[PDB]
Design a protein around this motif. Structure first.
Motif, short mmCIF file in Angstrom:
data_model
loop_
_atom_site.label_atom_id
_atom_site.label_comp_id
_atom_site.label_asym_id
_atom_site.label_seq_id
_atom_site.Cartn_x
_atom_site.Cartn_y
_atom_site.Cartn_z
N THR A 195 34.38 3.24 25.96
CA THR A 195 35.30 4.26 26.44
C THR A 195 35.44 5.38 25.42
OG1 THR A 195 36.47 2.58 27.72
CG2 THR A 195 37.66 4.64 27.26
N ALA A 196 35.68 5.00 24.15
CA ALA A 196 35.73 5.96 23.05
C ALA A 196 34.42 6.72 22.91
CB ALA A 196 36.06 5.24 21.74
N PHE A 197 33.30 6.09 23.24
CA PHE A 197 32.00 6.76 23.17
C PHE A 197 31.86 7.82 24.25
CE2 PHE A 197 27.56 7.01 24.54
CZ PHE A 197 26.95 7.41 23.37
N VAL A 198 32.17 7.46 25.49
CA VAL A 198 32.06 8.41 26.59
C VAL A 198 33.04 9.56 26.40
CG1 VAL A 198 32.20 8.69 29.10
CG2 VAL A 198 31.27 6.60 28.13
N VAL A 199 34.30 9.23 26.08
CA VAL A 199 35.30 10.27 25.95
C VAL A 199 34.98 11.19 24.77
CG1 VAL A 199 37.76 10.74 25.66
CG2 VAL A 199 37.01 8.80 27.04
N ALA A 200 34.55 10.61 23.64
CA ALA A 200 34.19 11.45 22.50
C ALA A 200 33.05 12.39 22.86
CB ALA A 200 33.81 10.59 21.30
N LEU A 201 32.03 11.90 23.57
CA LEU A 201 30.93 12.78 23.94
C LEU A 201 31.40 13.95 24.80
CD1 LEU A 201 28.08 10.32 24.83
CD2 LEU A 201 27.71 12.25 23.29
N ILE A 202 32.37 13.72 25.69
CA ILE A 202 32.91 14.82 26.48
C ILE A 202 33.80 15.70 25.61
CG2 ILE A 202 33.92 15.44 28.68
CD1 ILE A 202 31.77 13.69 29.25
N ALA A 203 34.64 15.08 24.78
CA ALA A 203 35.53 15.84 23.92
C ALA A 203 34.74 16.79 23.01
CB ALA A 203 36.39 14.88 23.10
N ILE A 204 33.77 16.25 22.26
CA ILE A 204 33.04 17.03 21.26
C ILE A 204 32.29 18.18 21.93
CG2 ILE A 204 31.14 16.94 19.59
CD1 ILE A 204 31.96 13.97 19.18
N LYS A 205 31.59 17.88 23.03
CA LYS A 205 30.83 18.96 23.65
C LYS A 205 31.75 20.02 24.23
CE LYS A 205 27.23 17.77 26.23
NZ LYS A 205 25.82 17.34 26.41
N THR A 206 32.90 19.62 24.78
CA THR A 206 33.86 20.59 25.28
C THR A 206 34.51 21.36 24.13
OG1 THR A 206 34.33 19.08 27.09
CG2 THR A 206 35.83 20.93 26.79
N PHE A 207 34.86 20.66 23.06
CA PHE A 207 35.51 21.32 21.93
C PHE A 207 34.60 22.38 21.32
CE2 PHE A 207 36.50 21.62 17.42
CZ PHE A 207 37.84 21.97 17.48
N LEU A 208 33.33 22.04 21.06
CA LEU A 208 32.42 23.00 20.46
C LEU A 208 32.24 24.23 21.35
CD1 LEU A 208 29.78 20.64 18.91
CD2 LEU A 208 31.38 22.04 17.71
N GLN A 209 32.38 24.09 22.66
CA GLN A 209 32.32 25.26 23.51
C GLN A 209 33.66 25.98 23.61
OE1 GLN A 209 28.85 25.70 23.32
NE2 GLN A 209 29.59 27.02 24.99
N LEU A 210 34.75 25.22 23.60
CA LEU A 210 36.08 25.82 23.68
C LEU A 210 36.40 26.63 22.43
CD1 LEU A 210 38.88 25.82 25.26
CD2 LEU A 210 39.41 23.71 24.01
N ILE A 211 36.09 26.08 21.24
CA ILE A 211 36.49 26.73 20.00
C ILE A 211 35.75 28.05 19.80
CG2 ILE A 211 34.83 25.82 18.29
CD1 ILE A 211 38.74 25.86 18.11
#
Ligand SMILES: CCCCCCCC/C=C\CCCCCCCC(=O)OC[C@H](O)CO
Ligand SMILES: CCCCCCCC/C=C\CCCCCCCC(=O)OC[C@H](O)CO
Ligand SMILES: [Hg+2]
Ligand SMILES: [Hg+2]
Length: 270
Positions: free
Chosen positions: A230-246
């Motif tokens: 769960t932490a793996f899937v969520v982190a993969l979405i978080a990181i890719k979204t964050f790098l685009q959001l920031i």
């Protein structure tokens, strides 16, 4: 089943907050308190789902991470910078050294700051730090891309990672603030903190997993595994979204969100 439903909730919490500068540890003490999952077995559960979010950075920066240790997969690595420079293992090592030394020397003392009142303070203070980095950073970043970072930028980010030993302060918050204050762009500073987290956290969990190995049993494996991926899937979405959001957003809203989380720590624990 409660045990697996909770593992999935902590898993999404870990995967969102671990690399966002918002203190995964802070979010974990609130939710773990609200779920009733707070024993010695929970602190060992919350460190193994950290490895799940670790793996996500490993997957996302697979070719970059192996290139730093000398393994180039028969294709040119993607260049991220305005210069002909290339991030090297020396950058990582300088980013690790200060926090490693201080973390080793002050292990017992660091462990004694895990209070909810300290985590509340670290959420506010780290949020102020983010504000300061956003207000003090140069107009024109010296390292716009990751491959433009210098040994000095890497080392100074590394010293800023000592603040991350303060429970609640958020490793990514400390290292991204330092990065921006050293003229590293939001994007490259985020990227460099994710890369730096890999050796940092994998030695952190391995260390915690050894000292806390006695708690693990046969029945933990179902719970320990649902949280992990769960932490793996969520982190993969978080990181890719964050790098685009920031790329478009600043860190001010994260800093303000940290203050709200501080209020929650006081409401929930005092
Ligand atoms: C697990 C507990 C929850 C985890 C807490 C997560 C932390 C996020 C908090 C503040 C950041 C707010 C910034 C993100 C909101 C941006 C959404 C948006 O649409 O902004 C894009 C903008 O339009 C650009 O073009
Ligand atoms: C222990 C961890 C340390 C945390 C640091 C605490 C507070 C920093 C907040 C101070 C931010 C105020 C700086 C604003 C400023 O002076 O800006 C100048 C100008 O914008 C530039 O040219
Ligand atoms: Hg300002
Ligand atoms: Hg330091």
């Amino acid at each position: 089943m409660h045990s697996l439903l909770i593992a999935a909730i902590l898993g999404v919490v870990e995967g969102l907050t671990e690399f966002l500068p918002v203190s995964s540890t802070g979010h974990m003490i609130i939710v773990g308190h609200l779920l009733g999952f707070e024993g010695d077995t929970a602190k060992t559960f919350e460190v193994v789902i950290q490895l799940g979010s670790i793996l996500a950075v490993v997957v996302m920066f697979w070719r970059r991470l192996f290139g730093l240790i000398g393994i180039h997969f028969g294709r040119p690595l993607q260049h991220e910078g305005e210069s002909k420079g290339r991030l090297t293992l020396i950058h990582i090592l300088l980013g690790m050294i200060p926090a490693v030394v201080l973390g080793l020397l002050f292990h017992d003392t660091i462990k004694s700051l895990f209070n909810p009142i300290n985590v509340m303070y670290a959420l506010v203070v780290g949020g102020l730090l983010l504000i300061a980095a956003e207000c003090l950073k140069p107009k024109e970043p010296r390292a716009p891309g990751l491959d433009d970072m210098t040994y000095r930028q890497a080392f100074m980010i590394g010293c800023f990672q000592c603040l991350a030993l303060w429970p609640g302060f958020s490793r990514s918050g400390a290292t991204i603030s330092g990065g921006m204050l050293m003229g590293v762009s939001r994007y490259a500073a985020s990227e460099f903190s994710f890369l730096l987290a890999v050796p940092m956290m994998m030695g952190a969990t391995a260390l915690d997993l050894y000292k806390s190995w006695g708690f693990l049993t046969s029945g933990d494996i179902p719970m320990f595994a649902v949280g992990f991926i769960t932490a793996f899937v969520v982190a993969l979405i978080a990181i890719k979204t964050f790098l685009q959001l920031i790329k478009r957003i600043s860190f001010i809203p994260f800093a303000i969100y940290r203050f709200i989380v501080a209020a929650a720590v006081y409401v929930v624990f005092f």
